[PDB]
Each structure stands twice: as C-alpha cells, then as structure tokens.
Design a protein around this nucleic acid. Structure first.
Lengths: 135, 214, 111, 144, 102, 56, 148
RNA sequence: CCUCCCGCUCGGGAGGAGGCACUCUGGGGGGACUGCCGGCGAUAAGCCGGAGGAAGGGGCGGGCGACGGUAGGUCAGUAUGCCCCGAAACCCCCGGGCUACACGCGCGCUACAAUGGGCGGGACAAUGGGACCCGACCUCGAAAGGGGAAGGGAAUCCCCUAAACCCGCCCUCAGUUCGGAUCGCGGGCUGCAACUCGCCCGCGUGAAGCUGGAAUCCCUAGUACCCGCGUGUCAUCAUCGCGCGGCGAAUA
C-alpha cells in the first residue's frame, strides 16, 4: 500500500490527513463523515471528491483529523487537504489544474488569518472610536 | 432527516443547496454574463475573500451576494441559545451562518409554489429589480444639474439584489412573513415585475424620475 | 397572625437555635456567626433597663442588628449620622433590621 | 459492524431512549421532572423521553471520556440564566438529574465507578450500545 | 547512576541558548548519556496597561511582553558528574533546576 | 492628659485601602499585584530597568 | 378531545381561555407558568393541549390542589409563599390572598416607620439604587404591579 | 503485539506496548527585490498591466511622534518653588455620606419575537490565569453551595463548558409562552459586618417598550457587521478597561 501525509490549513482549522489504499473510509476526528449536523459544510468537503471522481474515492481510505474551531472552519480545512491528498496520489497535472481553474481555496490557504484588537480610546473592538457629540 | 441525506447524495453530483442543478438556467443577455456566478458551483459561504481587487466582487456566487445583503441590519447586543436573539434581527444583527438557512428555506418556499429551478426565478428577479437609468444630483463646473446617468451591469445587480433585500424587511416586520417566506414572495414577484414587489416599484421610479430630469 | 411569631413570650424562651427556622437567611447569619464587641456592651444596657443598676437610655450606632423578642419594649436611640432618632419597638418588628426604623437621610420633598 | 462513532446523534438518541423504556431497568423517578429540574425551563415537560435522553447521552459520554465527573456533566449541557439587562452568562444544570442518573445506570450494570476515582463503561453498558448502533447503521444504508 | 533533569529557564533569548548549547557540549564527552536540550513553551506574560496618568482624551495603551523560555535536559550521570557540568558561568538571570531520581 | 497608643487600629482586612505600593505610598491609586506592588504611573517609569519590552 | 368549550370557569368564577392550559392559568393571579405545570401532573392531564377541552370533573381536581398544595406534594420552595409572617408553615396565594398579603406587609412597615415602606410611598425602588434620572422623560416604572 | 465491544466474518472503534511521523513548541535559516515581461512616462524617477508562485509592487498589523502650542490636563501618584494650618485645614474612632432625585444630557448594555422560544441530541476553539490559589473525582443538597479528596508553582494537572451552528420534536405571531422593571417570601456565599448599599438560586408578582423628530457618530477586509471566551484590578459591586478565537460582507 502507501502512506502520503499532507496538511490543509484555513483560518486556523489545521487538518491532519492521511491517504492510504483500501475500501472507501471517510474518517473525521474519529467519526464517519455521517455524524455532522449541518448539511451544508459537508457538501463543501464533497466538492473535490466529485471533481476527480467517485472511482478514486471508493478505492482510497481517507482519515482526517481537523482540530479547528469552526464548523465551516473544519470543513474548509477538509476541502483544501483531500484535494491535495488526491493530487499527490495520482500525480498528474490534470487533477491539479482542474482544481485551480474551479477555485483557489482547494490549493491555496490564505496569506492572512486574524488581527489584534487595538488598544483604542476606551471602547469595544479593534477598529472603533468612542462616540462624539461635543460640537 | 432522510430527505436531508438525499440532499447530501444530490449536491455531490453537482447541485446548489442539495437539489438545484446549476445547468437548469442560462444567462441569455451578454451584459449580466461576466457579472454573475451562476456558472460556477456548489456552496455560497465559501469565504473566498472579495473586493480584494478592482472587480474582486463580480465572481461572488449570486446566492452569497444574496446572503450578506440579506444579513445586513446589526448593532452591539448578544445572541446565544439561552433566552437570547436580535442580536440577529429582521436581517442578521449577526452572521451569514444563520442567514444561509433563510435563503435556503426561501429557495424551498419559492420552489414549492413556482416548481421551477428556483435559480431560474432569482436570476430572473436580479435582471428586472435593477433600474436601467438613474439621476445623480451631479454638478460639474460649479453648475448644479440633475442628470442622465446610465447604469453599469455591476451597479445594476447591486441595486437589484439590495432593493429585493430592502423590500422584504418592511413586510416581515412583526408579521407572518418570515424572511424565508417574505424573501421567497419577493423573489417570485421581482422575477415577474409584478405590482407587488417593493423592489420593482423603485427600479421603475428611479428610471422615471431620471427620464423627467434628462 | 397578630403579633409576629408563635407568641411574643415563647420567642424569649426559644432564643438560641429555635428562632432560626422562622427567620430570613440574612438575620440567621448575623446571630449565627455572632456580632462585634460594641454589640456586647449593648447587652449590658438592655439588661440595666429591664432590672437592677441605674438604667441608661440605650443609645446605639447598631444599624446591622435584627430585632429579637427580648428587646421588644425599650425606646431605642439610633444615631441617624447627625442625631439620635427614637423608636418604640413592637412585636411586629421581629424579623426586620434596626437601621431601617431610624432614618439615613432627612425626609423632605425633591425640587 | 458499528460503534457509537458510526451513527448520527439525532437517530441514536430515540433508539437508546426506547431501549431504556423496554429493558426496563432505568425509569423516571417522580421528583426529577416535577420541580427538581435543570436551571430555568420556559415550561417543564411531562415526558418519559425527557428522562430517557438525559441518560441516553450519559452512556455515550462515559464511552468517549474516562473519569467523567458530576461537575463536568452539569456544565456539558448548554443553557443560560438571566441577570437582567446585564447580558446572560454560562451556568450549569441540575445535579439532581445527573447524580440519580449515573446511579440508575450503576444498578443496571451499564456504568461502574473505577478505583482511580471517576466513571467508566462496563462491558454490559458497552454491548447494549454496539447492538443498538449495529441496528441504526444498518437502517441508514436502506433509507434514501 | 541517577537520571537528573536540568530544567533551565531564562527571561531572554540569547542567555538561555548559550547555556543550553554549552551544557550539551561539555556533558557529551565523559561518563554521561545525555538526551537532547528540548524547548518547552514561552509562557509569554502580557501586562496590558494604561499609559496616560490623566486617563484622558485618547490614551494610548502599552502592551507588555515578558517572555520566559524553558529548556529541559534529561541526563544519566552521577551527582559528581552533575557539579562538573554545573561549573559554567551562566547569564545573570538563568534559573537552573535540578530534580534527582534513580 | 494620659491615653494609650494609636497608629490606626480599625479593620482593613481587604480591598484597596489594604494595599500600599513600594514607591509612592498610596491606597486607592493603582497596585499591580504580581509581586510588583507600584502604581501604573511608576510602572511606566520603572520598566526598562525591569526588562519589560515596549514592543507589542 | 374531552368536550369542547371556549369558556370553562376555573379557580372560582375567573375565566379559563382557549390559548393553552399552561398559559390560561398564568393569568389567574397566584398560579404562574411553572406552578400551572406542577398541578397538571397531580391532576393527570396532557399539558400542551388547548384550554377549554375539559369536562366538569377536571375543574374540581384543580380547585382542591389550589386550596392546600402542600397536602398533595409540591416542595416547600416550589409552593407560593413558604414560612409566612413568622408562624404559618406554608400557605397558598391566589388573586385575593396575594393582593392582601402584600398590602398587609406594606401596611405593617408604614406603622413601623421603616426605610422600606415610606420608600414604596414616595415612588422609588429600595435596593435597585438609581433614582438619579431613570424613569426618564416624564416616565415611570409603575412600581407594583399592573398597567394593562 | 495485547485487553475490551460489536459484526453481515467483509470489517468499525477505544486502551497499553510501541513509534517520533504529524500537529505543535521556540531557536535558527531561506523566500519578494519592480528581479523578469508589456504599456504609460523625458530611454531617468514613478504609475499601470502580465506570467510564474504560498505570498507581491509601502505584502500585511503594531511599536516608533521633530522644533513647538493650546499658559490644555495633573501640585489629589511621586518629585518640587511659594503660601497656609498648628488640639487645629492635624489625629483616632464608630456611624452616616459618595449608591441622595421633579428633571436635563453624554457614553454604553439589554430590547421591541417565527432569520422565533422550550426540550433533547450531536460537532467544534483560542489568549490566558491558577497556592490560604485553580480545583479532578466522589458524595449530600432542587440549586446557589456544603462535606470529603487526587493533581498541579505548570507544553505533562485544573478553571473548561466555547458560543454562534445544525437535526428532530412540542409550541403557532399576542404586548403574548415577547420583555424583563417592580414587589412578597424562602435560601446560599464573603467579611466583624452586605438596611442604607452585594450577587446568585427557586416560587409567586410581571411595569415601560410593538422599530423611534429635529439632529448626529463610527468604520474601508479577515476589517466592519456578528457570537461567545479569558484576564487585569480582584473577598464583594464589571451593562467597564485590556485581550482572544468562531461566522464573515457592503461601498469606496
């Protein structure tokens, strides 16, 4: 068989993925892909897996562990890594360029994540000032 | 819950929100073709960051554009499952997360009556809710005019979707029109150009006041 | 029930422990934990007045004492902050604070 | 061919809560829904399901965790209390529905207290579950 | 022999690394088996403070860092092979803890 | 006349009036309790010798 | 169903609506929304159905769980007033007992000459602090208890 | 390899051996510089557009604020010229006052419901703080809390549960099951002591408010908008100040 370990990181959901051959396993943090309640962020994970095909999804075991705060955050870290897990597998430029033309959230993360809350002039949030009315 | 999972087998294949094929519709006008993300795929939430570039906001999934101009109204106050709200408004004093549900149930409530691919009723409601002419109180050379200004396909879309999203919250106001409904009964009647769309009443008036002034 | 409690007399004979089940959470606490060394010199001047050595007119800065059944009858002089304001203590005053009855402000109209 | 891992938590909970009516060892005591309930409830419900869900969770949670305490399961529910116009804050549930529940499971032989100081599953609590999940995961492939 | 832990922290970056490196160099060659100098966290300490003593207008607010870094070292040597290695000069300002177990 | 000593003798078990600094000798003004009891104003003057860093 | 009515009379002659049983009793002063669902149990009814679907026989089971609730069950912190005026163990409160018991204790304090009774006469919260400018722009709390 | 469960015997999951791969931790090194390509520009400076690429043309966010001035602000933090007090404008003490209110405004929180409420279930973080201090876990108590007690001066233990989310169920738009003021009572907790003047828990009580004139403020992207989370100071008053991550735009 094989072991190709990859990563996928979006807004600090770090997905730890492994792609070995088998029988159609989809593991997320220990639980099948079935346990999630929002239908929505599931479909996001599902986007790459059809762009390539069910053929390669069925023939390969994917276990990922996404330690990330967001529900959509987890999903997004799962969308970037499967796509990178499937481009290392087959090896061709056909599956890589087909992802890039569709969206760059499969193969690029961000350049940025979050900004600090500025000291500010005694109010709440990074970018805000106390209200004025002294004119 | 079982239909819900069929809604997970079906978007896979590929279709928006679980059961709307993105090929059902076409953009017949060559004006609204590059300005609309009908053609690309699956999820609005995306977080693909826009306004990054000059037109980093044209490539925005039509529905995502819907979600956050449908999310708009919002201050200060605090929401959680507790006792707890409003804080997420008559238009998300809060997130695109519980916004995306409203637009999904409004695609469900507009499909239930019309029975068409609802992405053929909304893309038929954002080519009609946009006025074709606008007057700006524009002065140039120190000389105050109120003038013929024609509208650009990007600034069209925006006035289409925003006037759709502004009309519904006057009606949903402390009323049985739920936004999942009040939006679904705005999107049908902006598609039709009906005399019941607070969004096709400004479209017209903004062209008609602007014709007088020209 | 006229007169607060079982009867005015039976609550002078139940003092430590048995009153407690009747009282508020707040009155219990200050009896049960105890009160300060100025509250110990005020148990001589209620006792000089009921019997014996020449009685002083009882004065107090005690505004944290909650009225008991034995102290019902005496005319208690509670310093409002400037001067001593009198209170003839009743059996309907069992269970209230002593600093309620004397004022914490002069009482006039606002304007 | 199933664990509590393989079944969604919306289909697992009415299948274990029924299997807590049926067996029929765990039951509602009368004092626990009446007025000894968890924090504040907009209404108090007169449900068997109410008791059978607060326990159907307890057999899933001790599976995942080792030393799962009373102070953990009181704080694990999710729910608040008003202070006023001051915004709400995070408080914990009623320890009465959690300290009788573990002990109704403890007499049933589903949970046991370990000698390290804590709460773990027995084999009888672990098999009661894997059978109920083998029935749920089998039904989830039949149903489009 | 006696497995000793040298747990060595310092308030600044330059002072902590020189000692950690020197401890792994001198111990290397004698009657010592030594496990490598492992870096644990910086419990960066934030003191977040009001500048202005008026507390008036806009007051610009100082962010403070105290960063304290902790290297850890297991070693298999005697109590006599330990002092030989604890000879070293050490920056001001570098805490060196010693636990002793068999 | 004659009387016994005084250097204050009332309760000051806890609060701000319990504290004083080791540089400007105050009760109500700031007392940073990390084992560095000073006011906020001293703190600013003292820190570069402490080894705190301005940079965020 | 158990014989439709739109107005059955419960708790004396005061009226039971067609909203829901748990909300129809809340109105009847003395029975709230938590105390309504404590007397649905003892009596043996479905709590979530409409009010007015009651024969004559259900209306008698509620009026005797009200007169003395501390006889049927109802814990000694889950009953309306526990430990009353220093010598009643527990009682019930209803539109006539609640109105009288609260004006009595207020009649008691004014004679006592306290800082609670005259603070309920001038127009003020006693422990809520600010009277500084709240109830602002001519406004008013309405103190206790009803401006509907 | 080994212990436990389940099974359609194909196969799913946990523990410990075992293994440092991965995440991560903190120390060091490379990578972006208009380098290249086109257009505009005096072939210069520079601006625009393009390709390759994780990232681009101040990459992005902070700290970093000259000579001075408003006689701005503070001698009520300290330092200090001058003046004034001297059983006092000192000193000690208890109690009361700063928390008084017919009202006016500023800055904010909470809020006028179906994008909703109850109930249940399930999937998810980060900064931090923790010795008369964080407190596992076990027990009693409806709960607030009390009794017992492990670990921890810290990547190794504890606060700790994130919240928003979603799925099913009950409920079916009224000043209400909204909203929580006000008042009665029962009860805990700290301190000598919470009436004046603390917070929470339970039952009863259940006020204004059903989208707000003139006028006016804040901000330009991982930002605003939104959701919780921690810390400071610290017994206790936080709808505050500082700071963290989760969802994630409009227009320019």
């Amino acid at each position: 068989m094989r072991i190709i370990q990859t990563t996928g990181k979006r807004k600090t959901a770090i997905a730890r993925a492994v792609i070995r051959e088998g029988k159609g396993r989809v593991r997320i943090n220990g639980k099948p892909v079935e346990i999630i309640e929002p239908e929505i962020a599931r479909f996001t994970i599902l986007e790459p897996l059809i762009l390539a095909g069910e053929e390669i999804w069925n023939s390969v075991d994917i276990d990922v562990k996404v330690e990330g705060g967001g529900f959509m955050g987890q999903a997004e870290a799962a969308r970037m890594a499967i796509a990178r897990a499937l481009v290392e597998w087959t090896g061709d430029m056909s599956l890589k360029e087909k992802f890039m033309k569709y969206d760059r959230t499969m193969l690029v993360g961000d350049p940025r994540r979050t900004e600090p809350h500025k000291p500010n002039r005694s109010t709440k949030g990074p970018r805000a000032k106390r209200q004025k009315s002294y004119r | 819950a079982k239909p819900l999972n069929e809604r997970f087998f079906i978007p896979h294949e590929i279709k928006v929100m679980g059961r709307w094929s993105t090929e059902d519709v076409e953009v017949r006008d060559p004006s609204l073709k590059p300005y609309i993300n009908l053609e690309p795929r699956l999820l609005p939430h995306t977080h693909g960051r826009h306004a990054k570039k000059h037109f980093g906001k044209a490539n925005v999934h039509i529905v995502e554009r819907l979600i956050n101009k449908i999310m708009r109204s919002g201050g200060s106050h605090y929401k959680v499952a507790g006792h707890f709200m409003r804080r997420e408004h008559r238009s998300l004093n809060s997130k695109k997360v519980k916004a995306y549900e409203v637009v999904k149930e409004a695609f469900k409530i507009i499909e239930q009556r019309t029975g068409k691919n609802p992405i053929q009723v909304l893309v038929w409601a954002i080519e009609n809710a946009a006025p074709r002419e606008d007057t700006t109180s524009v002065m140039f050379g120190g000389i105050r005019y109120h003038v013929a200004v024609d509208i650009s396909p990007m600034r069209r879309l925006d006035v289409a979707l925003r006037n759709i999203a502004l009309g519904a919250s006057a009606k949903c106001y402390r009323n049985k029109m739920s936004f999942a409904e009040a939006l679904a009964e705005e999107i049908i009647l902006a598609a039709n150009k009906d005399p019941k769309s607070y969004a096709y009443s400004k479209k017209l008036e903004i062209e008609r006041i602007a014709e007088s002034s020209r | 029930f006229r007169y607060r409690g079982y009867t005015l007399e039976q609550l002078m004979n139940m003092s430590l422990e048995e009153l407690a089940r009747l009282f508020p959470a707040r009155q219990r606490r200050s009896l049960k934990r105890g009160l300060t060394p100025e509250q110990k010199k005020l148990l001589r001047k209620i006792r000089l007045a009921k019997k014996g050595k020449y009685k002083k007119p009882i004065r107090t800065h005690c505004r944290d004492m909650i009225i008991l059944p034995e102290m019902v009858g005496l005319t208690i002089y509670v310093h409002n902050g400037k001067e001593f304001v009198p209170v003839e203590i009743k059996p309907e005053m069992i269970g209230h604070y002593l600093g309620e009855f004397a004022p914490t402000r002069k009482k006039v109209e606002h304007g | 061919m199933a664990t509590v891992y393989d079944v969604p938590g919306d289909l697992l909970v009415e299948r274990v809560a029924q299997r807590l009516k049926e067996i029929p060892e765990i039951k509602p005591p009368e004092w626990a829904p009446f007025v000894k309930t968890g924090r504040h409830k907009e209404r108090l419900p007169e449900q068997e399901d109410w008791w059978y869900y607060r326990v159907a969770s307890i057999l899933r949670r001790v599976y995942l965790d080792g030393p799962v305490g009373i102070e953990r399961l009181r704080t694990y529910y999710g729910g608040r209390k008003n202070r006023g116009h001051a915004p709400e804050k995070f408080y914990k549930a009623g320890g009465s529905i959690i300290r009788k529940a573990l002990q109704q499971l403890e007499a049933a032989g589903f949970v046991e207290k370990v000698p390290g100081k804590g709460r773990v599953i027995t084999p009888k609590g672990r098999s009661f579950l894997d059978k109920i999940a083998t029935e749920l995961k089998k039904e989830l492939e039949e149903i489009i | 022999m006696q497995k000793a832990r040298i747990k060595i922290a310092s308030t600044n970056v330059r002072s902590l690394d020189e000692v950690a490196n020197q401890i792994k160099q001198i111990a290397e060659r004698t009657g010592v088996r030594m496990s490598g100098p492992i870096p644990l966290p910086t419990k960066r300490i934030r003191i977040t403070t009001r500048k202005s003593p008026d507390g008036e207008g806009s007051a610009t607010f100082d962010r403070w860092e105290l960063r304290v870094h902790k290297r850890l070292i297991d070693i298999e040597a005697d109590e006599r092979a330990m002092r030989q290695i604890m000879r070293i000069r050490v920056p001001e300002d570098v805490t060196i803890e010693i636990e002793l177990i068999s | 006349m004659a009387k016994a000593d005084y250097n204050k003798r009332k309760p000051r078990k806890f609060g701000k009036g319990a504290r004083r600094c080791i540089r400007c000798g105050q009760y109500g003004p700031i007392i940073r309790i990390q084992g560095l009891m000073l006011c906020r104003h001293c703190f600013r003057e003292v820190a570069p010798k402490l080894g705190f860093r301005k940079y965020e | 169903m158990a014989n439709f009515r739109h107005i059955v009379r419960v708790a004396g002659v005061d009226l039971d609506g067609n909203k829901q049983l748990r909300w129809a009793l809340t109105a009847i002063k003395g029975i709230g929304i938590n105390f309504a669902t404590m007397v649905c149990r003892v009596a043996g009814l479905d709590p979530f159905m409409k009010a007015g679907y009651l024969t004559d026989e259900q209306v008698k089971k509620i009026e005797e769980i009200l007169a003395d609730p501390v006889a049927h069950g109802i814990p000694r912190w889950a009953v309306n007033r526990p430990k009353d005026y220093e010598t009643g163990r527990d009682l019930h409160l209803i539109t006539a007992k609640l109105d009288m018991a609260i004006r009595e204790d207020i009649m008691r304090l004014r004679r006592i000459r306290a800082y609670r009774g005259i603070r309920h006469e001038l127009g003020l919260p006693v422990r809520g602090q600010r009277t500084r400018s709240n109830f602002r722009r001519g406004q008013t709390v309405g103190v206790s208890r009803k401006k509907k």
